[PDB]
Amino acid sequence: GPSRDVKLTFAQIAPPPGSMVLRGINPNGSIEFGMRSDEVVTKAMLNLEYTPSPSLLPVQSQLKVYLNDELMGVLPVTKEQLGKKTLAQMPINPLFISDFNRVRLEFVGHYQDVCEKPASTTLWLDVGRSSGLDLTYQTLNVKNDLSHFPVPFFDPSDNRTNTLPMVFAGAPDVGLQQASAIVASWFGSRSGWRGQNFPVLYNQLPDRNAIVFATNDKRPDFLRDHPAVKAPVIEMINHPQNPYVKLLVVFGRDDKDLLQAAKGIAQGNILFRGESVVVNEVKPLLPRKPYDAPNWVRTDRPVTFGELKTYEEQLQSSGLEPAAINVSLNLPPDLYLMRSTGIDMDINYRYTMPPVKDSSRMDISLNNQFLQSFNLSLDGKTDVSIPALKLGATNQLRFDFEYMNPMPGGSVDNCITFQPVQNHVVIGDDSTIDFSKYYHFIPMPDLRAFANAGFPFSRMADLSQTITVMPKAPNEAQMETLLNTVGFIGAQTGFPAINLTVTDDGSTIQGKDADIMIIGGIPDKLKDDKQIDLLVQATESWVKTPMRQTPFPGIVPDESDRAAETRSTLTSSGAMAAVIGFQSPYNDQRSVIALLADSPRGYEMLNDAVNDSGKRATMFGSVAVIRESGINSLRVGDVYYVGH
Amino acid sequence: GPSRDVKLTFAQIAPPPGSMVLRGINPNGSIEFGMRSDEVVTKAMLNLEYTPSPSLLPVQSQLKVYLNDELMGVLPVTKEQLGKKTLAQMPINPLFISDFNRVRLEFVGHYQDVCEKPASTTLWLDVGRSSGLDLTYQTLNVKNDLSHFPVPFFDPSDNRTNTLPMVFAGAPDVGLQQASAIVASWFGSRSGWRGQNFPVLYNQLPDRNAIVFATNDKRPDFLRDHPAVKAPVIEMINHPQNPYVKLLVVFGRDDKDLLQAAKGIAQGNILFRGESVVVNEVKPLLPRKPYDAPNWVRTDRPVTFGELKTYEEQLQSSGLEPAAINVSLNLPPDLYLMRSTGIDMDINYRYTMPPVKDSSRMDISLNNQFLQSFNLSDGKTDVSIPALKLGATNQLRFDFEYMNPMPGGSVDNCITFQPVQNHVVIGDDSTIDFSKYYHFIPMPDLRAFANAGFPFSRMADLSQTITVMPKAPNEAQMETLLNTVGFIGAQTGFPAINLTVTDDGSTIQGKDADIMIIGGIPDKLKDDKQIDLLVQATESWVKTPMRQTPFPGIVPDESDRAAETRSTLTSSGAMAAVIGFQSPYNDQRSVIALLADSPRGYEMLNDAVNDSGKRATMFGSVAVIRESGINSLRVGDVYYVGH
């Protein structure tokens, strides 16, 4: 079977800073990696480029490698490697590996053997960011059972961006488009932060796990002599060229049957069994609530920290120096602070009584911004008022415990020291955080929330109040960008779009209360609003520039730094994509976000910018222009507030 | 491609104390540099001529060399070189170099082993300012794509002056002059504090990247083969001799199309695509308000610290000794307060609560001068800044001075530990009022012009600004015009797009706008009243204002600033005269004249206007720039601008 040779380095598995330093207080460095439970590793090796300390002793210092609680090897320090950068090759036995492994490097060092100062900064060993673990994956044969779903298509263990191409049969219909969008949104919600890309190709066949859409009419070229189905059925067959890649052929009589199948897949994914699964009836019971997403916190009532734990071992730490506890809480980017009172949180922290009252403080930080420090000299219910002014869509709350332990040293001749004792730190699980007093009222025309959270469309979980307009007979690129943006919206939230509406005519939205989404060409029905700032055409394009451009604006905007100063029009022969956001001419409380290109290369740029989270989270303002030189954003046009 | 050896001394890249000392509380010494993004660094080595402390332990004390959090090598101190001067060269791996690199040196020291105490002045390692980085840049070939604009001409990762020569077609008319001035203003505004220089050549291709201006009738050299165009196009072609340098060719049917192309390049440059960009329609919607410049602070509303960061972690610090938090305020030089109460600001600082009140404080200072102090024993303090040094640019520095009352045990039992760090943060919500001021100042001086360009930069777009130029100017006068326009544009944050370049004095008669004389003073001017330093290329006369006292009062006096003697003399050298006076047509408008007597004088004037060290030392109403520097004096009548 096929076997790839991936060589992951130390710059994408190690902490953000990269090169880690192994001191005496934190001598453990862990890097995590896993396989998709289908491919088997072979010929795995670890290359370490470390530079020991010139002070530590040669033989009494060593670097231990632990794959999973098993010492794979021990590299000692020699007299020549005392202060020189040395390359060490460590073999990794491909037998103790599992679905998820954490290679842990532990460094022990001793510079003095008589009166060594524990936790001294003279001893250190830092691995280089050029290190890497080279391992080859070999693909095995899948059992071909729909019970394991979506394991063969999408495995949550893989950290690489999910690549799931969808193959239509050319010129999708109205129902087929919305069903494919539902499936893509479900896959994006299943993926999450991993990032998802759906390369769509018509009447072709890739060499990767794909999804084949069939409706008993306009079937792909290779779905020949297949019997018609009475009800929507989902069958998992193999590729005819090679049996080492599994497809997903969804069937149905008409577009409505395929939509029912997609709804059953997105919702009833827990009843999948065997190989073929027939859907017969799917009906809801009650609608969803606004601003209610599984990934977003509950703003209606205070939520405990127990509902904000990714793993059970998040709210506890140990060791000579207790590490900082980091918690993530996603919330909608509509929190507007009116009374400047902030949020009130009660932290029920339990700590260790220090030997002396030396103020082993504890600090709370929000996005690397110190909020307040509490003395430490044992649960305490403190009412912490957070002066929150930069609460966006995603943040990170850090509780650090700066422990300083005085150790009796004695005198010059009477050198006596004590080894450090480990301190246990735990945050109270009953601790709560309140977000009820925060209101929902913000400037609408900004798309920073759209790129970070998708707020304009993600008002409700199932996207009921959203209408996406598509051009007649879409090509590959238009459907590709549609699927990509729908999957991104679904991943930013926690629930897929089940009640989304797709239309091919631009006059069908006249008189409806919904958020309009333009994917291809802006229809002439609403193009006359003139609030659309940047328009991309075959070769011409005109943009409007504001009066003042500030890198960091204030909390409340002003009508003086957003008015269009000059309008510049020009034409060229290059590629350029545009992301614009304006007010709908049919309602004063809804918005329209349009992603538009002109050429296939522009669509490719738009897809590369939307799929990747590095280039997408760097846009703000009202308008964004994506070109070969990345993406440039500007805040032009009048501002209109949304909310109450 | 050509290789240029570069030696960056430690003086021009480190903070301006000259040298850096690495103590036990501040062992981090940082050095920032950048890469042009179109060149690759090869054979980079770091030299260090440092002195350690003699009380250091030889093996248990070393220094690191981190390049973007990557240890290139560690240097220990041997017993023989414990107190002596130590020179060491370390090879730097060019693979980890990026657009903006920060080399941080960390020093670890241990003078004792059983009872060593931090914050002690017995252990130290100081690097002299004789060291520097030795690296050889190697240019590459860009993709010739206009989407990366103005990347090949101006990179935000550079630190040296941006020399951008502009090749015209010879004897440019008013339209070409105005277009070149607009382009130079835009480039200077994009550059900013990096320094701007715009040499001009006629039918001479330069070595560096340049901009070519064409008209389809007076075609310059090496462009006769290019076919005629139907509309103003912007194309970036390669230099025929050496392709590693790029030239920006601007075409147009006539001067009006060239001006339109320049206006489009200035404003509509965010959507350049591929190559040969055709600009057709560039029209404005509404005019610009006075005192509306991006770099200058907004006076219509109270301004917060969020709009004055220009950074990400400027309002916060950490470590044992929290570094000072500096915020720069760029105010216009036209500010007058009769109430004399001073501007009030609402500081919302917060800090780490120390264990016991030990008189740890925070000092707020302005222009490197102590202003106020607050004890740390989390607030909305109203601080009234006395307006005594508020000029055109300043620096507001909050320095959190701490001292930790850490115990040390008894004489027979000394305790050991590691000192804890403390974080400080101001918060991007502290506002400062600036609407309680008026715009009324006596303006015969040149300090506001040299520092901010006030009389001409009242409107960021230079709408009411008339610059005269001689008939068929040479390279020197055009260079002077381009340089002064670029400087005015860089002091502000908006390109001068609506400036008016004229050639005859008939347009000056009956027009409400400031005057900028470059070539020479016209006949209607230089009436020998309120005008000094008339240089007829042979002799010159200067007036002494009866007194020359450094550091005058805030409000100037009229008894001292009065002409006493008119000394006339003929010489054989070269001089440049900067003269500021009042226009006879309008009382509010003013006339600034930058003139020279000889080509060497024009060169000295261009050099003075280009740099910034010799420009900040210019004040008064008259400035004479000779081969021995610039000397200024305040003479003439006083006229007030403002209501």
Author numbering:
A (entry chain I): 68 to 444, 463 to 729
B (entry chain H): 68 to 444, 464 to 729
Task: Provide the authors' original text about this structure.
Phosphoethanolamine (pEtN) cellulose is a naturally occurring modified cellulose produced by several Enterobacteriaceae. The minimal components of the E. coli cellulose synthase complex include the catalytically active BcsA enzyme, a hexameric semicircle of the periplasmic BcsB protein, and the outer membrane (OM)-integrated BcsC subunit containing periplasmic tetratricopeptide repeats (TPR). Additional subunits include BcsG, a membrane-anchored periplasmic pEtN transferase associated with BcsA, and BcsZ, a periplasmic cellulase of unknown biological function. Cellulose is a common bacterial biofilm component produced by a variety of prokaryotes, such as Escherichia coli (Ec), Salmonella enterica, and Gluconacetobacter/Komagataeibacter xylinus (Gx). These Gram-negative bacteria synthesize cellulose and secrete it across the cell envelope via the Bacterial cellulose synthase (Bcs) complex.
Although only the TM regions were resolved, the subunits were located ‘in front’ of BcsA near the periplasmic exit of its cellulose translocation channel. Taking advantage of recent improvements in 3-dimensional variability analyses and classifications implemented in the cryoSPARC data processing workflows, we reprocessed the previously published cryo-EM data (EMD-23267)20 focusing on the BcsA-BcsG complex, Fig. S2. Interprotomer contacts within the BcsG trimer are mediated by TM helix 4 of one subunit and TM helices 2 and 5 of a neighboring subunit, suggesting that BcsG is prone to self-polymerize. To test whether the NTD mediates interactions with BcsG, we performed AlphaFold2 complex predictions using either the full-length BcsA sequence or its NTD alone, together with three copies of BcsG’s TM region. The predictions reproducibly suggest the coordination of a BcsG trimer via BcsA’s NTD, Figs. 1f and S4b, which is predicted to fold into five short helices (α1-α5). The C-terminal helical region of Ec BcsA runs roughly in the opposite direction as the preceding amphipathic helix, which is present in BcsA from Rs and other species. This segment is resolved in our cryo-EM map and interacts with helix α5 of the NTD via an SxxPRxP motif (residues 850–856), Figs. 1e, f and S4a. No direct interactions are observed or predicted between BcsG and BcsA TM segments. The BcsG TM helices fit seamlessly into the opening of the BcsB semicircle, between the first and sixth subunit, Fig. 1e. Our cryo-EM analysis of the IM-associated Bcs complex reveals a single BcsA cellulose synthase associated with a trimer of the pEtN transferase BcsG.
